[PDB]
Design an enzyme around this catalytic site. Structure first.
Site, short mmCIF file in Angstrom:
data_model
loop_
_atom_site.label_atom_id
_atom_site.label_comp_id
_atom_site.label_asym_id
_atom_site.label_seq_id
_atom_site.Cartn_x
_atom_site.Cartn_y
_atom_site.Cartn_z
N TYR A 1 52.29 47.69 68.86
CA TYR A 1 52.87 46.89 67.85
C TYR A 1 52.03 46.08 66.88
O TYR A 1 51.09 45.75 67.27
CB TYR A 1 53.58 45.57 68.68
N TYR B 1 55.46 49.61 64.76
CA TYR B 1 55.92 50.18 66.31
C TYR B 1 55.55 51.61 66.41
O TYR B 1 55.99 52.44 65.64
CB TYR B 1 57.31 49.82 66.39
N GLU C 1 63.06 45.25 66.31
CA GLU C 1 63.39 45.51 67.78
C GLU C 1 64.12 44.21 67.97
O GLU C 1 63.64 42.96 67.47
CB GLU C 1 62.07 45.74 68.43
N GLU D 1 52.64 52.29 73.78
CA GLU D 1 53.34 51.73 72.77
C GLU D 1 52.85 50.43 72.21
O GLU D 1 52.31 49.72 72.99
CB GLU D 1 54.73 51.12 73.84
N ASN E 1 68.25 45.72 74.47
CA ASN E 1 67.21 46.23 73.81
C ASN E 1 67.38 47.47 72.90
O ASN E 1 68.02 48.19 73.02
CB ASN E 1 65.99 46.43 74.52
#
EC number: 3.2.1.8
Length: 185
Positions: free
Chosen positions: A80, A69, A172, A78, A35
């Site tokens: 998105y 992000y 990502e 977090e 990742n």
């Protein structure tokens, strides 16, 4: 309006070759990755920011996201706004939809556990998602009117933290290869 932040993070898996290009431009060539999140944006996110980008290259070979992000603290989130992706469309607990910037986005929450946060701690935190229902065309200027997502998320009890960390237009990737070239302002 200019970016002042370079997000370049990899978990070390495979090859993540990020180029901090001119201004808001960046590109990423990756291969056989774990990742990673790479992007340009702003050291301090705003719920009011209108993010502009142009993804001149959006070429994931497998699983990648083309996504606003960022993070907040208090709470630790977090988040998105996923405009495009590769072979895999990310989802979670469906909350509803939000229309923004000529797209319809599904709204999701997930939680991460035993997961590294912005702050390095392996911990638990919630993710907020808007994921476009179909992939946004790339290669022309695109706007993410983040306030629309913020308002929609709020309406579904997805409140962002009062402490804004960075806010980037990101590539990502998970377990993949690909190329991206994205300009953010």
């Amino acid at each position: 309006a200019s970016t002042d932040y370079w997000q370049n993070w990899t978990d070390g898996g495979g090859i993540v070759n990020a180029v901090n290009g001119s201004g808001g431009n960046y590109s990423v060539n990756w291969s056989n990755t774990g990742n990673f999140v790479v992007g340009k944006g702003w050291t301090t996110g705003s719920p009011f920011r209108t993010i502009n980008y142009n993804a001149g290259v959006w070429a994931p070979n497998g699983n990648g996201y083309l996504t606003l992000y960022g993070w907040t603290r208090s709470p630790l989130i977090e988040y998105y706004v996923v405009d495009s992706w590769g072979t895999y469309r990310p989802t979670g607990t469906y909350k509803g939809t939000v229309k923004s910037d000529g797209g319809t986005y599904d709204i999701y929450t997930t939680t991460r556990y035993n997961a590294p946060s912005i702050d390095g701690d392996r911990t638990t935190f919630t993710q907020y998602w808007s994921v476009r229902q179909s992939k946004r065309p790339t290669g022309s200027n695109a706007t993410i009117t983040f306030s629309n997502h913020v308002n929609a998320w709020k309406s579904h009890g997805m409140n962002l933290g009062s402490n804004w960390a960075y806010q980037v237009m990101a590539t990502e990737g998970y377990q993949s290869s690909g190329s991206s070239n994205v300009t953010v302002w």
